[PDB]
């Protein structure tokens, strides 16, 4: 029933709002200045990065050169994101009933693809929102960081620019994310069929969502399926830069949650 597919779409959106503090809607309102809220502090060089030490708050408490501090910062944000996404995954009907090791597998291989999907919502061509909109770091400043770190985020800005041109909203994104998490082809899944059945229904929900929400863009569904494939490539490039960094540099500390996810991740 199409009605049930709209009800599912709405359930996912409502769960998505619950799970993720900064939505695309709110992020766009910030990036365009439509909001009543105080403007993000702009980090555009080393000096402004230093000044931002006070203004910007991080949820984690932390009583190294700049490039490293920024990289570690992205680490900790990623750790936050994994927990938010885990909470969202658990709201997808059927997910918590799957074999628990399969849940772990879906998350392990899914989370980075979701991170970069959602990161796009915080990006425009000029930079990215950080710490729930409290700060804005320019694409140029990140690009200006010494190698390998100057190339760390550029692949993602390039993805976001093209992805954002599709003009998805939070309602589209909730279903798009759900489909990705419920990928039956992740390495090492034990019980594939129940995941495939769940994803098949989510895909129907996505197709109907896009037909209704983007009436004039027939091609959007086929393009989003390609973006899913693309996202895997973005994650591959990221993992390989991660190995380069993990060697090109004298060792920094990697968060154990990320260490666990990285293992066997390509």
């Amino acid at each position: 029933e199409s009605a049930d597919l709209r009800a599912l779409a709405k359930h996912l959106y409502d769960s998505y709002i619950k799970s993720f503090p900064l939505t695309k809607a709110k992020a766009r309102a910030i990036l365009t200045g439509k909001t009543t809220d105080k403007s993000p502090f702009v980090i555009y060089d080393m000096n402004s990065l230093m000044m931002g030490e006070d203004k910007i708050k991080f949820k984690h408490i932390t009583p190294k050169e700049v490039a490293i501090r920024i990289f570690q910062g992205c680490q900790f944000r990623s750790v936050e994101a994994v927990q938010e996404i885990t909470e969202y995954a658990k709201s997808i009907p059927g997910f918590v009933n799957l074999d628990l090791n399969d849940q772990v597998t879906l998350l392990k291989y899914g989370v980075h693809e979701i991170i970069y999907t959602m990161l796009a919502s915080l990006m425009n061509k000029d930079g990215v929102l950080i710490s729930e909109g409290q700060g804005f770091m320019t694409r140029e400043f990140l690009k200006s960081l010494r190698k390998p770190f100057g190339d760390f985020m550029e692949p993602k800005f390039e993805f976001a620019v093209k992805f954002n041109a599709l003009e998805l909203d939070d309602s589209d994104l909730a279903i798009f994310i759900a489909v990705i998490i419920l990928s039956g082809d992740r390495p090492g899944l034990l019980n594939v069929k129940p995941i495939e059945d769940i994803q098949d229904n989510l895909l129907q929900a996505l197709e109907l969502q896009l037909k209704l929400n983007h009436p004039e863009s027939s091609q959007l569904f086929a393009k989003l399926l390609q973006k899913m494939t693309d996202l895997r490539q973005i994650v591959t490039e990221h993992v390989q830069l991660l190995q380069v960094i993990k060697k090109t540099e004298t060792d920094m500390s990697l968060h154990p949650l990320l260490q666990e996810i990285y293992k066997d991740l390509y």
Binding site: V82, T86, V96, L100, N101, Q103, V104, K108, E260, I261
Partner: peptide
């Protein structure tokens, strides 16, 4: 695993 613990916590 850490991911398993996150999945199990209400």
């Amino acid at each position: 695993s850490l991911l398993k613990k996150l999945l199990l916590a209400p």
